Amino acid sequence: GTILIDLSPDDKEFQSVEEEMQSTVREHRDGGHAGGIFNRYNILKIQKVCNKKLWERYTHRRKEVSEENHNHANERMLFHGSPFVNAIIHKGFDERHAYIGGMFGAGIYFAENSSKSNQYVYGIGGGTGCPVHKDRSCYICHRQLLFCRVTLGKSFLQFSA
Amino acid sequence: MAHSPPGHHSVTGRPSVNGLALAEYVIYRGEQAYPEYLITYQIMRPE
Ligand SMILES: COc1ccc(-c2cc(=O)c3ccc(O)cc3o2)cc1
Ligand SMILES: [Zn+2]
């Protein structure tokens, strides 16, 4: 059901998404252990993900949550890095994409910092790095992140250490 | 997969020590997200 439409680097949509990726890179307290050492990315491709079944599931649930929260979905665009990105774009998010050991509970995690999600692209803590070189700071191999439309509803605020 | 805190739809994890860390979020249903863009990229080695 999923089709992927390449965006042109001249297209404003591509540019806004790249800007969201580039501008939300920060330094990490692990000094790059998990996600590598970089201040920016080389963006190779941005594709729009189109799946009617999955979109309608999302909006059905978005409306549900809107109604339970003063008509406010509290919808955001957020990043997600996973070794399971191929499965997510074809079948959707579900329980197998959950971070069972996560510090805010066993759920599906997203980040405003692109560089935070980059730490998960090869697995938790970066696993063993890229599959061709076993290098968590590989500069050669091609990585993929999702920039996702997310319904937060009423969101329990947990301050973290 | 756990449940949302009762009466809530999600958790906002807000770093309180790193002033430059942005927020991170958890959802407890896959239907609360749509994987809209797929970005293919390299990290770049600093000059
Ligand atoms: C399938 O196991 C996974 C997949 C993705 C992630 C993941 C992916 C993320 O993008 C992510 C961002 C911020 C954060 O605090 C946690 C995060 O976790 C974790 C475990
Ligand atoms: Zn590599």
Swiss-Prot record, chain B:
Location relative to the cell: Cytoplasm; Golgi apparatus membrane; Nucleus; Chromosome, Telomere
Query: Tissue specificity, please?
Result: Highly expressed in placenta, skeletal muscle, liver, brain, kidney, heart, thymus, spinal cord, lung, peripheral blood leukocytes, pancreas, lymph nodes, spleen, prostate, testis, ovary, small intestine, colon, mammary gland, breast and breast carcinoma, and in common-type meningioma. Highly expressed in fetal liver, heart and brain.
Q: How is it modified after translation?
A: Ubiquitinated at 'Lys-48' and 'Lys-63' by RNF146 when auto-poly-ADP-ribosylated; this leads to degradation. Deubiquitinated by USP25; leading to stabilization.
Subunit-structure text: Oligomerizes and associates with TNKS. Interacts with the cytoplasmic domain of LNPEP/Otase in SLC2A4/GLUT4-vesicles. Binds to the N-terminus of Grb14 and TRF1 with its ankyrin repeat region. Interacts with HIF1AN. Interacts with RNF146; this interaction leads to ubiquitination and proteasomal degradation. Interacts with NUMA1.
Say which family it is in: Belongs to the ARTD/PARP family.
What job does the chain carry out? Poly-ADP-ribosyltransferase involved in various processes such as Wnt signaling pathway, telomere length and vesicle trafficking. Acts as an activator of the Wnt signaling pathway by mediating poly-ADP-ribosylation of AXIN1 and AXIN2, 2 key components of the beta-catenin destruction complex: poly-ADP-ribosylated target proteins are recognized by RNF146, which mediates their ubiquitination and subsequent degradation. Also mediates poly-ADP-ribosylation of BLZF1 and CASC3, followed by recruitment of RNF146 and subsequent ubiquitination.
Q: What is the name of this protein? A: Poly [ADP-ribose] polymerase tankyrase-2
Q: Which gene encodes it?
A: TNKS2
**Section covered of the full-length record:** 1115 to 1161 of 1166
